[PDB]
Symmetry: T
């Protein structure tokens, strides 16, 4: 079971700068916490990670997931959440669970950060738990895929 | 470790009405899924549940948590999320983690449901995963309390 | 055929309010006018009246209507019509006709009195006719149950 | 006692419109339902019906009512309710009761259908009850003229 | 196959006034170029033209289209595009392909001209090509009507 | 020298209704005050008067003035001032002075009466002087035409 | 001479929480300082205190004031100031001097706190003086009530 | 009969700069056209002129008119029309006719020039006729004072 | 202990004009009642009064307060409250307690009067009590200044 | 005569996803139908196609058009239409006819899709005709280019 | 070459304001820094400095610059930048370069500080660089007069 | 001392744009003017220039500046200044001075060009001075590093 993890603009500078909102954890540190979680829980999940500062690369990458080795996407589109109708459109044609994660509680920051075009297109949104939000998304994803598969074959047979 | 779970207006009619947004699960059914989760994971957590259609009762109940047997609140304030500055004020003086949960993705519904006063006051917000969102909150809460306690005594000593 | 009449906040001080908008009639007097209209019309109709200044009690009541001795609701939510998303949701999940009544023409007052959340949920809205408006609501409620009940017997036989 | 019924634009295509909102009734059929309601009620009431798609003709008519064979007006200005300040002014200078009727619940449709200029000018507004709403308007119109006429004889004798 | 061409207010003053936006061509010259197009392309299409400065007349003529010698409508509702909820309703009830044409790019003009209520009701909108836009409409309408016909016989004989 | 005077909707009911904004003067009374003014001042001006409740008739009438017996228009578009882009467009292609008059000070009434589309298209606007505003417009018009004619021939010669 | 002091939601948590805005004083200490003021100034004034987190309770208690042992009300409706059209209505129907008090300067806080519906219904508003504001209210109320009394006997014996 | 003429900021630079909106006429030139008008029409009117760039001086000057040698004010508050609540308040306590004049049609310029606080306080508003607007105001003023005086003594006697 | 009382534009016209909002008392009478209060209460307080219709003068006089014979300011900036960012800045840089007073309840007036920029800069705001509000300000200022003094000697000798 | 066809983000996923709005046709099939049109109509037109999900790439390719093998551009900037001031600038500096095409009627969709910054920069806009719109663009472009050529030789030899 | 430096309200209290935004520099000190920059640069440049808290004095000064010993203006209108249409008009009719300077980054402060009316009138705006910004303005002012003066001699010879 | 100059989209077409706003200068030419200004000033300053039409590349570059051979950044983000929250975040985490430059006065253009997200993040903004603005940015950048570097040696010695 392949899960894609897409990290948006500036998230590679995470850990390195502004401990007030974000703390002292790098992006690589978040990705290995996600590994431990999977190996520890003994889950049959294989993670691929991708980070870009480019709106187009995010869209390209969501489009590749259609040719489905991947079964789900966990995405933090970063500042593009508030501006990108394109990425929201990409998500709406994925035909697979997409969960949005934000490190910070965007309902408590500047006014231009409150709307998430992208979030409205995703099935679910997690915000404000820092790195933890990411494992919450893995948990969520695994239940959803597990749920879909149980439904599918058990409904298909009869 | 005592966690309070507060369920807002109309959430007692859940399961009984409109399978399109909400599906076929009662409020009692959500509360027992939260029990299994705790007993299964072998967590030292004791849940108390409370549901009311009254803005004042929610505020009263948050105020009781100050006299702390309770260490955290998981709250779905329902339609009061969008209107209640009072409940948001209550949350801001709790002096303990408060996580907000919504069954539905409020970024994808009517315009008057997009802002959460209450959500802005909570440390974190989970939306759109249905009943599952609630266990995600338990997971989150347990890590946060575990984290705070590790920090506290290990920083206190030195 | 039992019909619930809910009256919202401050309606009990009716007969003592601004004499221009409201006149000099009492809430007790309106409920007589409705009985008289039932008597004189030979409408097999049992009316129950309930007035509160509490949002939550209105929600409680609407919810108790689902234990369905009652077949319709006539509601004047008062000032809560403009603020209560909670009551609007309850109306939406009553599964039975709800008619909103206002004494005054709310399109003709202050700006914040123009939107009715509750009214968007009801099947219909009546405003501007003072006390008489309740009798119009009765007239319609009787007529909608009669039409619904001819329609339920017209599709169980075929 | 003569009562004018004005019907606004597109109401003549009724019975051929969106079958959800409007059903399959005709404007001719509504006007029968109103006659039948007058007959069966023994209301000494002479109804005249007039439908136009022209703003100016509605204004013309309302104005001709001032040469007062007519004592009341029942109007459904249609789409012009949201745009016509002209018709609203005419209503304001008719010097006789005007009741606005809508078939559909206009609080429950598009944003631009929510304001009624014309409705703010009328004594009262009825929306959401389909054809039945016209009979409610009649009921009220009869009742307002009766009350006005008891009041005109109660202050010329003293 | 009759196509009704409705032209809105002030379009009769065309050609004679303001060369900067509108150029040197009269409304009658536009109706010639359209006939020329049909004649040259050899299409079995009869055009009928109509210009008015009256809102209710436009609605009237749309309403006449339903009694159908007319298979479609090309309309330039002029300034009414931005104000007329009523014409927009008429188009919706027509139940035939309607195309909206504008000589100028209404996206590049005053702010009150960007909104087309009528446009939102039409199947398609063409703007900013001067008189050419009118022929583009014809092309499209002939193509739309061809498909419908092909589709009509091929979907009954399955 | 021919001046056209166009009076908009409801202005024929003037004098007859609401002495608070408008006083006790009929439309015919205003038109004869305009006559006295011209004959008294010994002006070579001939007035034609026109009143309609129809947006289209106003536009038709402005369009006739192009075929110029008329040299100027004095217009009170009434409630159409605030809604009619069409009439404003008509005015902009007249190619002759158009002065707008309002009996009332529209900067002091309801909010929806503050903007005048039409006023923005006219060279000048007079408001709030009651019937007097009309002679002020005649004065203005006469100076403007007198000024234009002086300029024209005196500049043409050299 | 009884003055009813109504305190709104979360004011019972006062003194115990957030020193930056609110300082070190409990609600009970505020009620002492008020009694002290009355006692020292020697005024024939009996205070009665009441705190609630329930909207309908505030309305109830205002409604109880009409049956009048109570000559006036000092109210701090808390967060409800900004949301409660209903409390604002209650104050309007009370027919007695009501003063609104706020500990903090609501003009200098979040944007959603600048609007007081309740304040607009009160005779006067005091804000930003901490507990002192409460005594300022007493001063004013005693003065307002003194005038009324003087005025009451002096305007009947003319 | 003394009329005060107040000219607002930048109106002293008139004539000297930007012939496109304003033409080639100085402020002194406007004031002498107003003189000719009075002496020519043989009117018993004596004009005083005042120009300032100071909001306070305008207010001081309106306040002096109360001590009434003056019977009316003609005012062009310039850019202060759009910003000054103070000057509007001054005008509302003058207790004498105040007419507002603008050289330019402020309904046709930038958006921030459309509202006139001051204009809403004046009895009347004249805009867009250039210097001419000023004599139109003199005409208006003279009729108004003449009218008031005729009414006063003729109503006083009987 | 000098308290500077600054009064804004048009307050000098007080008492003489508009009895409905403002009543029968002159600005000089208000300054008497203030002196009387100080004299009777026996307080070691010297008042200095100042009224102006000029914005820059208010700023000047605030700026003079910094060179400090003056321990505080009571201000009613009048209409400038709603417009003057500059006065608001002056108050912020003053570094002394400033209280804002308004005779009327600016929450209950026109919409453009609800915003106080100056108020948001002051420590506290009093509104709607007529001349009384002025004494309330004195009380508060004397109390605020007493605390500061007590605090000043007690926080250096720890 | 080369025409550059630029297609925006997610248009490559066309045909494969969401039949309700977009239908059953791939982007490559659209490029065929365009070639077919050119081939059949016999036009001396060479098409070059380009699709990208990257904003800067669209700008790059427009910028390449200036070095001109290319006489014109047909563009569907996709979701970027509503957000990209930058693409809109590129189009403005191109100095060649650009037509904007949209498959769907963007006037009839979500509110954030009604605004086209790019559209306002193009000569003309076509929307709501599915793939057909693309050929309509070709027709128009060939006609626009024909005129320009004719005009170009005829305006130098005068 | 004489250059006027106008400084707006509260700039004289500089060196005593909020030490974060402004530091601890004085207006006297800034004017030295500008002299020093003129001296050390050998710019034949005579500087005059003027500071006021009065809108009208700024207008007076700008106007006196038209009696042109001065060739350029460097202005920091202060808080009036956001409110003064008057000053913006004066700048527009100075007929000479005007550069606006701000100490603080006004895009980075409160919402009401973001618009600069005055800045839209100036040739250029400088913000955010504290005192240094004045020397940048000088640099540019010198460079613009040099370029203008090469351009005035390059078109009087040809 | 190395200084990065980033240039945003379309700046490369400079010298070919609208000749009014931009003139006829090239991006190559601006970069010479900056070198020349470094040479002639003896500023030990190494400039690197980079222009892109891609949002992501700007983010990439700003990020690479953190591997700090570069000490300051001078950026003209172009159209992205009004839309890019991403670039604004990158600026915020560069940890070194960033100055925003615009050629044109963006307060003086279209409404959507007025806000600069990017500019709110920079230490300072320069607009309106065309090419010269870059040399002003250099001047300031040099001066800010000199001041920072005197300040870093003034607090490591103490
Ligand atoms: C320190 O550099 C950072 C850059 C981005 C973020 C992520 C956040 C972000 O980029 C915001 O623009 C967005 O609105 C929320 C965010 O995506 C998050 O909190 O996860 C965190 C740290
Ligand atoms: C079927 O009755 C229900 C009533 C409330 C809810 C919860 C949701 C709700 O009450 C909305 O008003 C709110 O904006 C979101 C909600 O709290 C949620 O999705 O959890 C679900 C089902
Ligand atoms: C020169 O007389 C004319 C009057 C109207 C029009 C048409 C345009 C119009 O009436 C506007 O109100 C509308 O927004 C766009 C218009 O319909 C068009 O461009 O076709 C063209 C020329
Ligand atoms: C009593 O019937 C009247 C109807 C219209 C009017 C004219 C005014 C009007 O129609 C308003 O809708 C418009 O905004 C201003 C008006 O045109 C005017 O004051 O002249 C006056 C009296
Ligand atoms: C060339 O200097 C002038 C300055 C002001 C004015 C008057 C106009 C003005 O000051 C605007 O700010 C105002 O909105 C309208 C104005 O008062 C008018 O057109 O009379 C005319 C010319
Ligand atoms: C009758 O002359 C008066 C002029 C001004 C005022 C004061 C009020 C005022 O100037 C308004 O612009 C302001 O919004 C409120 C006011 O300052 C107050 O109520 O104190 C009172 C009376």
């Amino acid at each position: 079971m392949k899960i894609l993890v897409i990290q948006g603009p500036n998230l590679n500078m995470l850990g390195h700068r502004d401990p007030r909102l974000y703390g002292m954890v790098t992006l690589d540190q978040i990705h290995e916490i996600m590994q431990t979680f999977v190996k520890q829980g003994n889950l049959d999940v294989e993670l691929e990670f991708f980070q870009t500062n480019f709106e187009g690369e995010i869209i390209d990458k969501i489009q590749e997931s259609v040719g489905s080795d991947y079964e789900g996407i966990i995405i933090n589109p970063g500042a593009f959440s508030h501006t990108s109708i394109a990425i929201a459109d990409a998500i709406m044609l994925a035909g697979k669970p997409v969960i949005e994660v934000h490190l910070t509680n965007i309902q408590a920051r500047e006014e231009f950060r409150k709307n998430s075009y992208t979030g409205a297109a995703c099935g679910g949104v997690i915000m404000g738990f820092g790195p933890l939000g990411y494992n919450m998304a893995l948990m969520a994803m695994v239940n959803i895929l597990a749920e879909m598969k149980a439904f599918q074959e058990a409904q298909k047979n009869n």
